């Protein structure tokens, strides 16, 4: 069914090309219905993320080896300001909103990704490398095209799957140009309940969907 608002769930990503969870983010359900899942990732939340096995942050590893060196997982507090994440069922992206301090809206970010798979504890995806940034003035640009390219060269995607990601990118860009959902929907005015606690990272955050 659908989770009640205020419910705590996990928003997760698998490792690239494998079954194990490498990102796990406890989030609070904002909305969950036939048209949309919306969740809030609060500052200070304990999350899991990948790191290189030698301790190098993934983003700090030179691009040539970023996707080839062995990885492990680390638990640590979410860095920086909170994120509201929105995803339509079946859609090969989610849209995340970020604000500067004092809730001054900054941008929407379209994260191209495998359509979320719902399971008992939350939703799982696989990241598709390419992102889009959208500004309040309705302009847009790609982000992480370099990572996308490298991931292709390293065989993390085959040309077919890469084609599908770019097709999704073009569909999201058509939505941005049309100023469709969720851009036009006023999520930038959304605020969390100040009563909501910060959700904990469950000890079994790594369990696979049955
Ligand atoms: Mg991404
Ligand atoms: Na979506
Ligand atoms: Na709007
Ligand atoms: Na919006």
**Treating both helix axes as pointing N-terminal to C-terminal, what angle do 159-177 and 145-153 enclose, rounded to 10 degrees?**
160
Q: Which ligand is located closest to the Cα atom of residue 112?
A: 1
Tell whether 137 is in a known binding site.
Answer: no
Residue whose tokens read 């500067």: 100
Tell whether 129 is in a known binding site.
Answer: yes
**Do 111 and 93 touch, CB atoms closer than 8 A?**
yes
Q: What are phi and psi of 35, to 5 degrees?
A: -100, -15
Q: What are phi and psi of 58, to 5 degrees?
A: -50, -45
**Do 164 and 152 touch, CB atoms closer than 8 A?**
no
Distance between CA atoms of 1 and 9, rounded to whole angstroms?
14
Secondary structure in 3-state letters for 144-156: CHHHHHHHHHCCC
Distance between CA atoms of 208 and 210, rounded to whole angstroms?
6
Q: How far is CA 77 from CA 5, 7, 59, 147, 174, in A?
A: 23, 20, 17, 24, 35
Q: Where the chain is broken, by preceding residue (C–N > 2.5 Å)?
A: none
Compute, in angstroms, the gap from residue 126 CA to the centroid of ligand 3: 27
Q: Which ligand is located closest to the Cα atom of residue 143?
A: 1
Shortest CA distance to 162 belongs to which of 130, 124, 116? 130
Residue whose tokens read 């996308």: 148
Q: Where are the domains of the chain?
A: 1-195
Shortest CA distance to 93 belongs to which of 120, 131, 144? 131
Shortest CA distance to 31 belongs to which of 187, 178, 136, 147? 187
Tell whether 158 is in a known binding site.
Answer: no
Tell whether 111 is in a known binding site.
Answer: yes
Residue whose tokens read 């700090």: 60
Distance between CA atoms of 12 and 145, rounded to whole angstroms?
22
Resolution value in angstroms: 1.7
- Length of the chain counted residue by residue: 210
Given phi > 0 = left and psi -120 to 50 = alpha, else beta, which region is 186? left
Shortest CA distance to 156 belongs to which of 3, 16, 11? 16
What sign results for the dihedral spanned by CA atoms 94, 58, 79, 75? positive
Shortest CA distance to 174 belongs to which of 83, 90, 110? 110
Q: How far is CA 199 from CA 96, 126, 146, 191, 196, in A?
A: 19, 23, 34, 17, 9
Task: State the fold for domain 1-195.
Answer: FomD barrel-like fold (2.40.380)
Distance between CA atoms of 180 and 194, rounded to whole angstroms?
29
Q: What angle do CA 174, 122, 34 make, to 5 degrees?
A: 50
């Amino acid at each position: 069914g659908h989770w009640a608002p205020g419910s705590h769930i996990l928003w997760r990503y698998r490792e690239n090309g494998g079954p194990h969870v490498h990102i796990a983010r406890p989030v609070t359900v904002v909305r969950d219905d036939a048209d949309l899942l919306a969740v809030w990732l609060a500052p200070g939340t304990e999350c899991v993320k990948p790191v290189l096995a030698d301790g190098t942050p993934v983003h700090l590893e030179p691009l040539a080896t970023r996707y080839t060196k062995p990885r492990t997982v680390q638990r640590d507090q979410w860095f920086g300001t909170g994120v509201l994440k929105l995803a339509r069922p079946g859609e090969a992206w989610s849209v995340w909103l970020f604000w500067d301090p004092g809730w001054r809206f900054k941008n929407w970010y379209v994260n191209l990704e495998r359509p979320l798979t719902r399971w008992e504890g939350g939703v799982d995806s696989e990241d598709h490398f390419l992102d889009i940034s959208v500004h309040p003035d309705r302009t847009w640009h790609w982000r992480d095209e370099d990572e996308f390219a490298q991931a292709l060269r390293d065989g993390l995607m085959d040309p077919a799957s890469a084609g599908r990601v770019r097709r999704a990118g073009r569909s999201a860009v058509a939505e941005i140009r049309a100023w469709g959902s969720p851009f036009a929907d006023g999520w930038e005015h959304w605020r969390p309940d100040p009563a909501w606690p910060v959700p904990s990272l469950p000890g079994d955050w790594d369990r696979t969907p049955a």
